Design a protein around this ligand. Structure first.
Ligand SMILES: *[C@@H]1O[C@H](CO)[C@@H](O)[C@H](O)[C@H]1NC(C)=O
Ligand SMILES: *[C@@H]1O[C@H](CO)[C@@H](O)[C@H](O)[C@H]1NC(C)=O
Ligand SMILES: *[C@@H]1O[C@H](CO)[C@@H](O)[C@H](O)[C@H]1NC(C)=O
Ligand SMILES: *[C@@H]1O[C@H](CO)[C@@H](O)[C@H](O)[C@H]1NC(C)=O
Ligand SMILES: *[C@@H]1O[C@H](CO)[C@@H](O)[C@H](O)[C@H]1NC(C)=O
Ligand SMILES: *[C@@H]1O[C@H](CO)[C@@H](O)[C@H](O)[C@H]1NC(C)=O
Ligand SMILES: *[C@@H]1O[C@H](CO)[C@@H](O)[C@H](O)[C@H]1NC(C)=O
Ligand SMILES: *[C@@H]1O[C@H](CO)[C@@H](O)[C@H](O)[C@H]1NC(C)=O
Ligand SMILES: *[C@@H]1O[C@H](CO)[C@@H](O)[C@H](O)[C@H]1NC(C)=O
Ligand SMILES: *[C@@H]1O[C@H](CO)[C@@H](O)[C@H](O)[C@H]1NC(C)=O
Ligand SMILES: CCCCCCCC
Ligand SMILES: CCCCCCCC
Ligand SMILES: CCCCCCCC
Ligand SMILES: CCCCCCCC
Ligand SMILES: CCCCCCCC
Ligand SMILES: CCCCCCCC
Ligand SMILES: CCCCCCCC
Ligand SMILES: CCCCCCCC
Ligand SMILES: CCCCCCCC
Ligand SMILES: CCCCCCCC
Ligand SMILES: CCCCCC
Ligand SMILES: CCCCCC
Ligand SMILES: CCCCCC
Ligand SMILES: CCCCCC
Ligand SMILES: CCCCCC
Ligand SMILES: CCCCCC
Ligand SMILES: CCCCCC
Ligand SMILES: CCCCCC
Ligand SMILES: CCCCCC
Ligand SMILES: CCCCCC
Ligand SMILES: CCCCCC
Ligand SMILES: CCCCCC
Ligand SMILES: CCCCCC
Ligand SMILES: CCCCCC
Ligand SMILES: CCCCCC
Ligand SMILES: [Cl-]
Ligand SMILES: [Cl-]
Lengths: 329, 329, 329, 329, 329
């Protein structure tokens, strides 16, 4: 039916004359995973191409479109799109190649395939875990400049569809939209580039329960010391020390999970402030023991330091929390 | 024998006329693994196709079916099934391609191959580890709409078989059955989709032994304090503190294993209630030490708080357990 | 030399008449690894096939066998064996395909290739780490039933050889032997299946040193308390508590390594019995402190409980060990 | 258009006569990751080749360059570059091979492809984490010596371009430049080799916060003991011991991350000096307890050792820090 | 130029007559990694073959050798070497296949390719970490026996070269040399096998610092107890106990890294002897407390046990160290 043997499909339609227009539309099937340590994300999608080539015309009375096996795709000419700034990708091939080819009697062509992509995404963690991130996937022709191929979204803003099943356990996904821009390479020329854009917002529940609450509880334990008889030395001393040494484990277990960035994150601030609050309660009792011993040496109830600490330490931590959750909301 | 050179197998049987019927049946060989963190499962199966094509007719006197080498599959036309919402898959190929082709003299065809698939499955953990999950595998044609190909289960409900060796160490597997539904894609049309469905139920033994019992034992240790002379300050204080700090390790070691979901799981409730029970026993002894010191200051046996605590703490935990195992059964 | 262009090698020798006999023999090169968590093992082997096809006859005066390049294997007919219940496999291909083809003037054929296989193996851990396991590798034709192909061991029990270098660091390997059985698939028919069988036995040394000895040592530490003056409250109390909290770490570190099976293992029994032995020593001293305080209240040496405990705790643990190593030998 | 059928492209242009000149230029798209444990780095780049072959001449009136499909690359002759001392690499192939071919009417050729490479890099850690490292990527022809192929940078120092998005979370990247050298293989001859060179500098913030500060804080805790009444034996003893045992955990957690090199790193020096400072504070109190007991035995305030230690320990650590940060800056 | 179309390259040179001689030489580019847990090593190398085939003769006046594209390798006959006892391997293929073919007018051939190999190596750890290991890589023809192919080192002992950059962070590499031996397979015959041999020696610095020193320091801490007043019960008891419990962590952290072999390693001996030294110091103080209490009961300074222990424990450990480092040097 199609006269494949008659033509040289090493050359594009319109070769040696004006540029060929190629239109694109897309459906996203899933957003698969995200990594802070690698700074990337993985996506699976259906991708579709539209153009005309009169070398593929055939006669019929119905004027309708026809589907073909799929092994012909390797004989005819086809556009050459690639995913810019991507780490790895593949086309699915069970039970055969997941590819589709449809042709109309006047030579209009529709071409479709299913792919998975892993792509680069630069991330800012200064407000982590209360952060928002924005991401994009980039599409471009490899060999042909804007003088030979013209690339555009087939139906404007209606060219992107999304599966209703798409979900991530840790993020809310929002704000899917598409854009276009021109790109330049010094050695080879000017090219059209298409963009798919989206926004992510992290759920904080896990971190409250797993990090902010146990820090708070250690700080509240350190306050119990102020209500204990100053003469019980081997009770008041280890009560302070053990909370210092627990807080260090909390601080380590958080930071072991994240990339080694050169700046402070919002969670770091809270934990190190909590640490100094606990550390100071140890110096307070050392002072009261020393001054008691000086009183014994002069001579030979509750101390004013204890009396004031019962008031000052809790007020100060409440003030800190009010400020912190006013800044990070 | 088969006249392969005579025909154009880029076109389906019946091309330009009504739809071709294709029937399917399946045997599951193994259910290989499951992941909560990735929310997916892996399956290995045998998959079979049935249709008629008169271009493959041949003469004989016996009217019986004949087997062919397998290299012909790439010359003739074959249906184009794919696994919807799948992450990855392959066809096995040692010592050769695991593929089978059988043909009858009137052109009826049977085609079979062996494959492994990894597929998406959305999971709810609000009742974890006492949870039940349900799963499915989806099958569809890639290129041909219901106007060109008709896809159905070959023998109704008898079209699914399962290997007697199938097992998972952590789940009971039940309720294998099959269904059908129509699907729509905005750019390309309507398609028939087949479903394989099944249910999983988790064994709880591991979690009892590994999580609920040691929490319970920490709570019971904290009660020993109420039976110890109130004057033994450096004994009663670390006895409380060490149980607080152990309970925190238990809570961490559980949640380190699971995905970071935005809601509370049934195991979380038990551990955090156990934590407050242990935390309160520390505040109780602080109260008794303070009131004893006030009595010393006024002046200058067992305390009523100890007397009551010996009764109230164990009753309250028993009431909690009765309610919890009434809710989660 | 071989008349490859004359014949249609899509059809088996004897096509449309009786079954073709194919004989097999094997040499194992290595048993590569084993996993309890995945329940599988990996093996590398040489696999060999024997049959006659008169379409490959050629003339000569010597009556001897001749070797050919290996690229012909893809032109002639070849049997279609596959490994049943396998997870993955491949054929080696550096510096070329590791394949061999030898032919005699009357058309007898010898065919050989090198492969690695990973295969399923169901494991029972009720006696772990003192367990024994048994395993097998299964071989079958994919497309041809016993009416068209007949599959058998070429030399009976002498058909399996094993490399003298084969070893595993954790298991003793024994009892290599071969068997045969018929298999049935509802949709497709009856098939011959060959079996390779073997037995494994675990070395216990590592577990003695790494698990049973340190548990025993914690139990013996808890006994020291009975020899310490009952008035040293802040010594006798933490001596008990710290052994409880160490034993919990031992119990966790063992079970973190194994699959989450729904039944108790032989190592679990020993560790939880050791735990209750340590837990009871804490309740004993609580009793002696309480009764001493009652004596003080009445009034206002070694206690009989201490005196008896020095005898009863060690006897009871020795009785337990005698029973346990009588059961698990 | 191109007369591909006329010629034998198993032979280079100029075969049997002088060497063919081939020019190269490059753009780096990303520097992907780095490993101290494996001593390697990964890079993604665009690579371009320039030469003349009159067998590819064609007629035209415009004198302009033309682009071709990409399937012709496998028919014509092409240069044979490889990455020396590399571990693994690949060429990208979705949605097709990422390859470009452009030809001028006189037979000048431009050829381009996109690749990812992982390459060897020897690292020195004697100053870690305050270290600087230098790296290079090497390019060479596999089959052709300088007598048959001449390889050079196409535009001198202007032949290397870099993407403005390139970044690493842990390193500052600097000093990209290119060089050339001749190489010799004993069995096969002399070859031209091109070099891409660059420098890395590590950010220290993470290590200050994660390692140097908590060590310092343990040392400062050990000093509190000198301010506590010498008669409080069960307070002063565990205060020392617990800091010893914490410092050991710090030392372990650092070195667990790095390769097992045979020499000391700058971080090791700081932690082991901090350890002896803490260890000595335990021997000091043992001395004061012993001498007090001798005074009791003779007989039957603050001790001079305490008085001096309050001065000497902090001065000595401050002197150490001044020297250390003078050496490592 | 080469008459490739004239001949049947499914047959070796000399087919049906005497054996063809094939010579080999090698250059090692890198030794990439080593695993105790898997018992294997990885190597990257250049491998070269030499033979004569008159079917490849061509005319010329210069009598010099000529290089060809590389796509011809798949048309002509080539030898069939494989790596015996190997786990996996591949040939590199960016930017094309890393393969070289050179031919002289009389039909002498040189053939070369670049490969990476992972190979089996049995290891003995009885002296670990002071151990020495020896390794080899094995090379053989797959299909052809010594009656058809003769395989030898091309230049005797001069046939192996090594890159000056080769290094491992944990081992000293020494003693590279080559050997030959004949091998027999029962079903198929006799074959020539070539060997590459080498020796490794481990650096001990890491283990001294990471394992032997901290054990020693725990033992020295336990000795402090002997210098402390026997009446300070709640000081002397936890001082012993905490060192016992630290030593157990040291023992665990070492053995978690290695394979589970059925015999004792040299590091195990040192750590378990150190453990009993620490354990005995706890029983000593229990004895002194008991005998003091008996003296109190009879009645109703430093004890001789303390006096002697100050001398005996350190002498005994010094004697142990002298013996141990005399045995393991
Ligand atoms: C198809 O084209 C024919 C003319 O060739 C026209 O009559 C018919 O309406 C067209 N149908 C559609 C659906 O565009
Ligand atoms: C979609 O369409 C509108 C037309 O109003 C144009 O603003 C815009 O670029 C598109 N929106 C986005 C967010 O890209
Ligand atoms: C096969 O077809 C023939 C007629 O062509 C019929 O006589 C015979 O019964 C059929 N056999 C089966 C098993 O259907
Ligand atoms: C199988 O067959 C029945 C007919 O009674 C129909 O209910 C059902 O859909 C099938 N069952 C399920 C559970 O899909
Ligand atoms: C090979 O066959 C010939 C007859 O064709 C016979 O004489 C000879 O003994 C046979 N040799 C072997 C080894 O079987
Ligand atoms: C090997 O040969 C014997 C013949 O005595 C038969 O018992 C047996 O099946 C084979 N042995 C095993 C263990 O399979
Ligand atoms: C191309 O070549 C023609 C002569 O063949 C010359 O006139 C023209 O200037 C050239 N153009 C460029 C851009 O080099
Ligand atoms: C680039 O160009 C200069 C010419 O001044 C030459 O020094 C140098 O080799 C190049 N620079 C480097 C750093 O390689
Ligand atoms: C090559 O062979 C010719 C004879 O054919 C001889 O004269 C010449 O010396 C040889 N050259 C080398 C390098 O062997
Ligand atoms: C290399 O050559 C010598 C000849 O003296 C022979 O001893 C030896 O086998 C070779 N050496 C080794 C170590 O294999
Ligand atoms: C102690 C944790 C407080 C968390 C406050 C969160 C406010 C949205
Ligand atoms: C940008 C730094 C914010 C620091 C706020 C501290 C709140 C107590
Ligand atoms: C303390 C754990 C109790 C577990 C109860 C389980 C009831 C099925
Ligand atoms: C849906 C929340 C259940 C909470 C029950 C608490 C049982 C004590
Ligand atoms: C305390 C461990 C005893 C191990 C006994 C093993 C007997 C074979
Ligand atoms: C089958 C259970 C065995 C339990 C034996 C307990 C030995 C003390
Ligand atoms: C205690 C850590 C001091 C860090 C000093 C860093 C100077 C650049
Ligand atoms: C090259 C060794 C440097 C050691 C300096 C020590 C600084 C206190
Ligand atoms: C306490 C460790 C001693 C290490 C001695 C090493 C002798 C080469
Ligand atoms: C072969 C065993 C060596 C044991 C030596 C022990 C040295 C104290
Ligand atoms: C901005 C640096 C903060 C450091 C807090 C310890
Ligand atoms: C640890 C500091 C104490 C100072 C008391 C005046
Ligand atoms: C003290 C906690 C209050 C913070 C409110 C955002
Ligand atoms: C529903 C939130 C519960 C939180 C318990 C700490
Ligand atoms: C820690 C709180 C104690 C309050 C006693 C009245
Ligand atoms: C107190 C435990 C009883 C719970 C019964 C389900
Ligand atoms: C058979 C169950 C045993 C449980 C021991 C805690
Ligand atoms: C902890 C239980 C003690 C009971 C004494 C009679
Ligand atoms: C008390 C240990 C003896 C057990 C003998 C098998
Ligand atoms: C150069 C060796 C230093 C060792 C410090 C413990
Ligand atoms: C631990 C050493 C103490 C020595 C006192 C003279
Ligand atoms: C005492 C810290 C000062 C070091 C300045 C580099
Ligand atoms: C040879 C066995 C030694 C065991 C030491 C605990
Ligand atoms: C723990 C053993 C002590 C024995 C004293 C005679
Ligand atoms: C006491 C350590 C000396 C050992 C010398 C090899
Ligand atoms: Cl105490
Ligand atoms: Cl601890």
């Amino acid at each position: 039916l199609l006269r494949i043997d008659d033509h040289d499909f090493s050359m594009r339609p319109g070769f040696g004359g004006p540029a060929i227009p190629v239109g694109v539309d897309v459906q996203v099937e899933s957003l698969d995973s995200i990594s802070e340590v690698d700074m990337d994300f993985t996506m699976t999608l259906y991708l579709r191409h539209y153009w005309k080539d009169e070398r593929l015309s055939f006669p019929s009375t119905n004027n309708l479109s026809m589907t073909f096996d799929g092994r012909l795709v390797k004989k005819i000419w086809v556009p050459d799109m690639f995913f810019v700034h991507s780490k790895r990708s593949f086309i699915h091939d069970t039970t055969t190649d997941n590819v589709m080819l449809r042709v109309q009697p006047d030579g209009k062509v529709l071409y479709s395939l299913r792919v998975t992509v892993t792509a680069m995404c630069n991330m800012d963690f200064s407000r982590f875990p209360l952060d928002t991130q924005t991401c994009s996937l980039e599409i471009e022709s490899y060999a042909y400049t804007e003088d030979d191929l013209m690339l555009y979204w087939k139906k404007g803003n209606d060219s992107l569809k999304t599966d209703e099943r798409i979900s991530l356990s840790q993020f809310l996904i929002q704000e899917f939209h598409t854009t276009t821009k021109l790109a330049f390479y010094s050695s080879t020329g000017w090219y059209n580039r298409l963009y798919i854009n989206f926004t992510l917002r992290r759920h904080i529940f896990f971190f409250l329960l797993q990090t902010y609450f146990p820090a708070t509880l250690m700080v509240m334990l350190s306050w119990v010391s102020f209500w204990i008889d100053r003469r019980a030395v081997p009770a008041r001393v280890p009560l302070g020390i053990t909370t210092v040494l627990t807080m260090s484990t909390i601080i380590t277990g958080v930071n072991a999970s994240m990339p080694r960035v050169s700046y402070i994150k919002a969670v770091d601030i809270y934990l190190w402030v909590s640490f100094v609050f606990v550390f100071l309660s140890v110096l307070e009792y050392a002072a009261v023991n020393y001054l008691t011993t000086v009183q014994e040496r002069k001579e030979q109830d509750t101390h004013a330091i204890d009396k004031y600490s019962r008031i000052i330490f809790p007020a100060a931590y409440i003030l800190f929390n009010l400020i912190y959750w006013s800044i990070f909301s």
